[PDB]
Chains A and B, each alone.
Chain A
């Protein structure tokens, strides 16, 4: 039938843009509610259908590489061959900054890929427009530096120093020093909230608002100094990873950890999560890494092994992932395919960036091009990898070519639509569900031989006589 592709389109749109199964129209009883729900389900079907139809208007294409012959394989490609075959607009982007005298470097892109910041551990913080090559600010900072990270814009960046943390403006003028956050070793900026979440050495996590300036919630992870930290951006929750071997999922609404997935027998060394929120990859001090389907909280496949304790890991906008271990990094392609219900181990890595004697401090992805930054002890090395990068951004959410007026309107709009910190859970689309206990109590207000033995044992330690206990004792006499 020629309507086969019609049913295929409708099924695919209902899968992708459905965001929910469907309203069951047949089971409603009131006539007006039946009519308005038929109307609503029709409007939503038309909405998802026209959204899938409008997904054709995307301009760019996702990068890729495939092996031609049977013998040559994908990880045996060299940067020279790539930069000879690829366009010059990214052959410019592939570069290497050499910095040797100021400790190992950690790099961190802003969330629009425009500006980056690199922190050499012994005090050297630099922020630059690496695409254009101009640097915004550079400073020697004196003492050591734990971790640098951009804020919402490329305007303010927060540096995690030896004792306090300091947030700075675009010229590197020091705006102010947060001293409530002592000995900060890991930082993550929840960007749809405005939250700076800092894990100290002491195991005390602190959530500070950046818009208002009051710390929202202090939590004390009672067990162990934290070894790793990242942000699940579909939930904005904090996957931190302790030392006894477990990764714990936290959020600022509870002193107890929300969940605790168990992991490698050593301390977990690095974590990363999908921006879809689907899967988390974690690598331990024991030589394995493993993934997890987060929405069901189980392991997906068997453990992969990396031939050293992995120093860092970070996964791209699309399904690629980069684990930087020892002195050279590797990139895997198909860890967690979204469509498959049962995942599969991949034979070989997608491609590797080789080792010439540089210990890798931290890998990151430039969030919107097909490149990837390594920060190693010899400096910064931005290499290119084709398959990565979300090909089609969204100029309402994040714009890699943002004008001044557009950045100002974006800052004030996100400030108006900041999310209150109480709206954080394991399912971020919940606001509107039934408070079941409240509803049953409201309906109550509108409408108005083994267990009794342990019940009497519980009530014989009060020792209230309790006419319900009296009736229960008479019943137990009757039995």
Chain B
């Protein structure tokens, strides 16, 4: 640390404590598999829509598995995973649609 507690107190007194204030503020396996995905290869640098999902300025060729990973990252960026993707008798009655019958 090489800082005294009294020195840290003089720090918090003289200079301010915005960093610690911000700190106190901000306190299933895949069942089936394919083989065509391993066999595939696509040119990210070639296709202009796929140009925007590569990582470095070297990624042009990619197999279908890592390609699927990039598309999954890009889908998650465009639309986040909603919280409902992550019994009670009355709640079961509400969620049953046989009850609301005219």
For chains A and B in complex, what number of residue pairs have CB atoms within 8 angstroms?
6
| Contact residues in A for B55 (Cβ distance below 8 Å) | 71
Majority secondary structure of chain B interface residues (helix, strand, loop or mixed): loop
Give chain B nearest CB distance to A354 CB in angstroms. Answer: 16
Within 8 A of A (CB), among B28-60: 54-57
Give chain B nearest CB distance to A317 CB in angstroms. Answer: 28
Give chain B nearest CB distance to A59 CB in angstroms. Answer: 15
Majority secondary structure of chain A interface residues (helix, strand, loop or mixed): loop
| Contact residues in A for B54 (Cβ distance below 8 Å) | 71
| Contact residues in B for A70 (Cβ distance below 8 Å) | 56-57
Task: Report the bound CA distance from A70 to B56 in whole Å.
Answer: 7
| Contact residues in B for A71 (Cβ distance below 8 Å) | 54-57
Task: Report the bound CA distance from A428 to B4 in whole Å.
Answer: 58
Give chain A nearest CB distance to B50 CB in angstroms. Answer: 13
Task: Report the bound CA distance from A71 to B56 in whole Å.
Answer: 6
| Contact residues in A for B57 (Cβ distance below 8 Å) | 70-71
Task: Report the bound CA distance from A304 to B56 in whole Å.
Answer: 29
For A70, the closest partner residue in chain B by CB is B57
For A71, the closest partner residue in chain B by CB is B57
Task: Report the bound CA distance from A70 to B54 in whole Å.
Answer: 12
Task: Report the bound CA distance from A70 to B58 in whole Å.
Answer: 11
Give chain A nearest CB distance to B51 CB in angstroms. Answer: 10
| Contact residues in A for B56 (Cβ distance below 8 Å) | 70-71
Give chain A nearest CB distance to B5 CB in angstroms. Answer: 31
For B52, the closest partner residue in chain A by CB is A76
Task: Report the bound CA distance from A70 to B55 in whole Å.
Answer: 9
Give chain A nearest CB distance to B70 CB in angstroms. Answer: 13
Which residues of chain A have a CB within 8 Å of any CB of chain B?
A: 70-71
Which residues of chain B have a CB within 8 Å of any CB of chain A?
A: 54-57
6 A-B pairs in the complex with CB atoms less than 8 angstroms apart: A70-B56, A70-B57, A71-B54, A71-B55, A71-B56, A71-B57
